[PDB]
Enzyme design. Structure first.
Site, PDB file in Angstrom:
ATOM      1  N   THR H   6       0.910  -1.177   0.000  1.00  0.00           N
ATOM      2  CA  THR H   6       0.000   0.000   0.000  1.00  0.00           C
ATOM      3  C   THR H   6       0.887   1.147   0.000  1.00  0.00           C
ATOM      4  O   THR H   6       1.993   1.022   0.510  1.00  0.00           O
ATOM      5  CB  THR H   6      -0.626   0.184   1.251  1.00  0.00           C
ATOM      6  N   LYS H  39      -3.062   0.678   7.604  1.00  0.00           N
ATOM      7  CA  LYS H  39      -1.674   0.299   7.992  1.00  0.00           C
ATOM      8  C   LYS H  39      -0.826   1.521   8.583  1.00  0.00           C
ATOM      9  O   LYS H  39       0.409   1.453   8.756  1.00  0.00           O
ATOM     10  CB  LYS H  39      -0.952  -0.570   6.892  1.00  0.00           C
ATOM     11  N   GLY H  51       3.556   4.015   9.968  1.00  0.00           N
ATOM     12  CA  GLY H  51       2.916   3.181   8.983  1.00  0.00           C
ATOM     13  C   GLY H  51       3.896   2.121   8.439  1.00  0.00           C
ATOM     14  O   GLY H  51       5.154   2.335   8.211  1.00  0.00           O
ATOM     15  N   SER H 130       3.467   1.285  -2.939  1.00  0.00           N
ATOM     16  CA  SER H 130       3.362   1.239  -4.379  1.00  0.00           C
ATOM     17  C   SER H 130       3.635   2.485  -5.160  1.00  0.00           C
ATOM     18  O   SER H 130       4.530   2.498  -6.005  1.00  0.00           O
ATOM     19  CB  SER H 130       2.029   0.707  -4.740  1.00  0.00           C
TER      20      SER H 130
END
Lengths: 180, 180, 180, 180, 180, 180, 180, 180, 180, 180, 180
Positions: H6, H39, H51, H130
């Site tokens: 993520t 997260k 995170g 990402s």
């Protein structure tokens, strides 16, 4: 790397004839350059829907060779479908070409492939490009399931819609076309 | 080569809770050994649906570690979901393991992965195995579209159905499960 | 390179239960070292047929673990089938192992795999090793078509027969086994 | 990816001459686009059966070159078979081409390959495309075993039948053809 | 790169029992380090011939585990053959090991493989290492052909001889062993 | 995949001149389509033996270019051998071609290669195609060994024979040719 | 696979000019087809030595183009060397070609390459083909050390000699050539 | 295939300290399973932001080890940062792990990697997962340019925003966190 | 290895039209040969901006073909854009070519690709070459956020700026261009 | 992908002892996370310079094992150098480790490698990490060339400087260390 | 394998213009054929230095096309540089060509690449071939550092020198050229 296919979906239900496609231009692995593109055209005095998948050179290009050959036989898709295949299959530059061509008429419906295939969907649903299958899976799904409850036009719209929802390479801005 | 995933589809609509999966056992590239297998079980006094994707050793095996840990916390999926992940993620033999685990309860719904992921579908549809996506694309598709017009049970049945239709690795004989 | 699987075929028709396998030991790419080998044994006071595929260590070896666990539960194939899976699937040395196991009884019939799969053929034909499919094709085909016209014993024999015909890895000398 | 071969099967038993092929058009890895296609044609005043495997351009295309050269020598398959080989083997575009050609007559029976091979089955069964072997296995197997018990037509039908059973690339809808 | 196998050939004709092997040590792709090595030993009060293929650590090493287990059963090759396989197949360090082991006695004859195979040549000829096949092809060739005209001893000698003649990895200096 | 080479063996002993080849047509990895094919022809008023290895288009094709050039020089193999090489080495379509060409006359004996090699066996034995080496190893083996005890004709027959025995891609039905 | 280079060695010491090459024709991985071949020719009224490496088509072929251009300039190696390079480097068929060319005269000495290189050894030793280096190593080594102690002719001979010793691709039968 | 990172973004501007991350869970190539996930947690009485990127097992898991060692030294990020590195770098299971960790405090800011790296951004922007760079690009860019014009909170938000725009792996629903 | 793209960035904000690109010429993996190059030209009486990415041959070259066809239609970018696509897409030498072309006018803005794509950014930012995205990220980001706060010229400048910051392939010396 | 090495350069000239390294942390292919990092430490009462290349876990980590073993022998680099190698070469976790270790003292100078090498530069210049060679090429270059004209300290500074200039993975902010 | 690049270094300092290159001809992986070659020529009435990297066919060849085009424009490097690129980039045979071309004049200095690049070194140092970078790193290094202390001529000499010292593919015998 390369530009990703656009997704395009054609369907034919209760005698309406329909083609939806996304706009999402996904460049490289992950990058997106544009969010809108027209690759669904109306051909031959709004008599045919055709969407391509690919580059708008390639795109435009194929399209006319389908035109040319459609006139060249007064309305017979199948025939012209074929005689394009021949033409595409043979040409050095398009024979290598990846994507396919969705052509449909008032009546009937065709996949047409760089490789000289020409395909006929038993159930009046065809689909190409990135999310293809996802929308194919929407298409076939709805028809089977809320045929009565929904339309041609509608079912296709939605195809795409679902695609963009599972599919990274497909996006919410949909172009929609139908014949009369 | 290897045995192919089974396809399995769970969905949760208008408070019915449902899991369909194919039977198709596709061995090697192309060969099919069986046409029926049960990988959707009922767990915990019919309180949970769980389907696995995989080998029935692996299958059975995971299942109990989900049981064990479900008792081990009196009904909290999420919790047990997790504590399995931990367990699966760590174990030498299952951490490598490919497929995932669909677990759902009266209430809610979880993907659970060899890799120690645990996932929560915003829209109450989860799907694993061969045709996954195809049925996912059916699922999400129907719900969005003939929610009113169809059921939990029904929508799932159909998922699979569509899958086998686009999908070589998915077959018509569907097992269906629901809670009360 | 490695030694090639032997082809083994089991089938179950009009209550006779049958296992045919070739003798061809095909080493390396192309070479053949032997033309006869026994990997179809009779197990448990001629109550079960089992053929393995593999190396006679691995062969022997699995076989006994299937013994041991057959006694360990007083005739239940499926049960022991499984509990073997478990054992095979886990073991460092057998887990990686390639070939599968065909086990059948008076009644019923199982594929059992290094991978922890255990498989049940809807139609009573199971098949492993090199030509496998070829003979599964023959199996399956005979039964559907000359069920009446031929036997257990005979149908199995033939499978292999046809194998060695299409298949370079399968050879004419067939070991045949049935229970009573 | 590409479209998958269709499976085609020809066989010749007790003087009937027969060609069965599936309809399954399997695109991409797993997807299926159509469930019916004609690639078994009747050639030369229903004197020859020929099925191709491939694309209906390639399909059509080869077919005529086999026509042209069949006339070009007043009924001699083998001859024309060859002279096609030559032509196919040489041509830039067809030489590379994957699939083969099954041609048979009243009398006799040929494999003919993009590669300039031309093949004659000792036992009157020829077979191409996806499930091929599977059905060759069935073919071969039927004839040896229920020659008496069944026909030309019937044996061919079945081959395919059995194919679609083992084979994910082959499907139930079969086109059947015989000469007089 | 690695050292190449030595070639070794065992054969058993008109009740003489014989093992020839080359000396050629071929290092790297192309380089040759030595022209003579002993890898054919006499084991167990000249009762057995055994040649290995490999490294003389590995070599020596296996050999004794064959001894040990030969005593451990008073003359039964087959038995000890096997129980070595088990031992070799399992051991971390030898299970990976490439080459095989040729063992023979007064009576009979065995291939024995790192992988836990144990093989029995129908026709009394076994052969391992670089030129294997070439000598195998000599062996089987002569026996079939000048059985009467030549010997045990002789036929083997020659095997190797031919090998070195087709084979880069096999050389003219042959060691020869027989029992009494 | 592709069709496998046929094996072909030429040999020249005590002034007899001989060429044996198998029939086995091995398609794909493992499949066998035919069990008999003629690729050994007699050329030039039974003055030459020539076997090819390959496709009968390619086959036939080369053959005549050897003819043409044999006339084109009144009996001189070597010469024509060469001038073919040139021709083959250069041609776009055959230069790529895999297999070789065995040509021999009353006198002498030649390998001739797509690549423009032309080879002369010191010992009057040449061999091509699948099992080549295996038969080469038989050939050279026998000659050296039962020259006196056997014939031209015979030695070749046998070559092949042995091949099919070690070799999956070689089969028992042998064609045999000699000059006078 | 392909045929292996032959090893060729030229050297020039105390005004004698010398070219040795083996005869070993090593086909495929390991196989040897012949033990003698001539690829060292005498060119231009025994004025030049040249050996090629390759195929006797390619061989012959290059040789003449080096003739033609040697005449084309009345004894100047270097010049013609070059102008060949040019010609070889350009030609579709020879440009790709692997091996190089050793050309030397009364006076001087050249490597000449398919790639359009042309090379001049500071120390009068040039070397090509399989064992090459091995013999270059021997060459170079002899001259530095037993220049006095040995000859042109002799030093070259030996190179090859030593080659066939380390090198599996090089063999004992050596062709030797010198100019006057 | 696997689940996609993520995207998470932390930045620190004019004394506010901020962490934004998307919700997009992108499974497999193209599929999306969820549109929301947490997260980005708050750690240590809302004193730290962290995170992670990864799996919520791995996620949870790391987090606590960073807790434990944060207490273990009374507020020193850098210290604990490190001592985690050590622990992560060593552990069999986490060492191999892909993603990194962003940890920041009132004061300062850290990248921390499965690999035992620990990183300090000169300019107070850190970024993982990402779209990372995309947002690092946006981050970095905003601060240099509209530092004045915008906030902590806001700049971070936007990063992600821009990400989901270029990046198919990043999506519109952003979790935002700051300390006091 | 090859030379690395240069990074180029065009954007269009509040009616100013702008193109920034770096100078960094990054050869090979890691090496840098130059720190300045011009690949942003002014075209057609300073009416268009175009930057290419590539080699100044390819560069120059494309540019003129875009000239020629711009005149060829009296100001219509899109038109000429296309007709170039066509020309580029077809040409043997430019079709394969990697980089794309940014062309913009008073009004509007285009990506144009060796592949026959032609692209129109919904939001007036286009971007090519090494750091591209990085700067697209910056572009896109600036405009959304400090549209008010900054200019055309300035926003473009900065993009590149930020690029050279994240990106090793992009460097500080920026060429800047605008129209009137 | 991974983090790139830092570049580090040690040199020893006219009895000054010096170590320069960049700060550039290059993540992934192209991305840069930081512009400053300390990986050059002073060890052992400023008696030794040591720079590592790698991760600061790995970094710190090695460092102390060099300490520990430096005390463990009262000033003998070489000795401790070695005994670390042993330690590093053996440890599971560092033996795999990529980078090396530059250690130097008042006197002398050492490369020390994960792999258990320990190296001594003839000319008093060592260099590790990204641009290594480039700075090595600067180092050796200057010393040889403006030994007199410049310093220890200076020459090293500059090394790095040049590196960042050819080298993408090396950056202008240099840390500098010397002993007294 | 192939011949390795020669290393060549051009530099322009305090208005002297200089080109050094090694002689080392490194064939194959490791082998060295020659120790001296001239690939630095003087062109155009000693007005230009040009070194190539490559084969002396290719070498010579390019050179004249640079001549031809230099006359073809009366002294303008840049111009002719370019128009060669065009020529080289396009030609089938040189466009593929690996190496580059260093051209310089009284004034200025150019890299010119098979690929149609033409490059201008900001700092008057260019370098090609094996050790390129190493000498580049020497060049730039010295100039920056003992500009005053050394010469054009000198600095270049030395470049190479350093190269051969780090670099296996570069050797001590240097050719040196300058203009007046």
């Amino acid at each position: 790397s390369s530009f990703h296919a656009t997704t395009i979906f054609a369907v034919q239900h209760k005698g309406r004839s329909a083609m939806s496609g996304d706009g999402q231009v996904t460049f490289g692995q992950a990058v997106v350059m544009k969010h809108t593109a027209r690759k669904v055209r109306k051909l031959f005095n709004g008599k045919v829907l055709a969407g391509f998948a690919g580059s708008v050179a390639d795109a435009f290009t194929l399209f006319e060779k389908f035109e040319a050959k459609l006139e060249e036989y007064n309305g017979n898709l199948k025939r012209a479908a074929v005689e394009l295949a021949k033409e595409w299959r043979s040409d050095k530059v398009l024979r290598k070409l990846e994507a396919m061509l969705i052509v449909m008429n008032q009546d009937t419906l065709l996949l047409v492939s760089g490789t000289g295939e020409v395909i006929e969907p038993d159930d009046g649903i065809l689909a190409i490009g990135s999310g293809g299958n996802y929308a194919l899976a929407a298409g076939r799904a709805l028809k089977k399931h809320a045929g009565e409850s929904m339309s041609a036009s509608e079912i296709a719209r939605a195809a795409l819609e679902t695609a963009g929802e599972i599919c990274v390479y497909t996006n919410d801005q949909i172009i929609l076309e139908e014949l009369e």
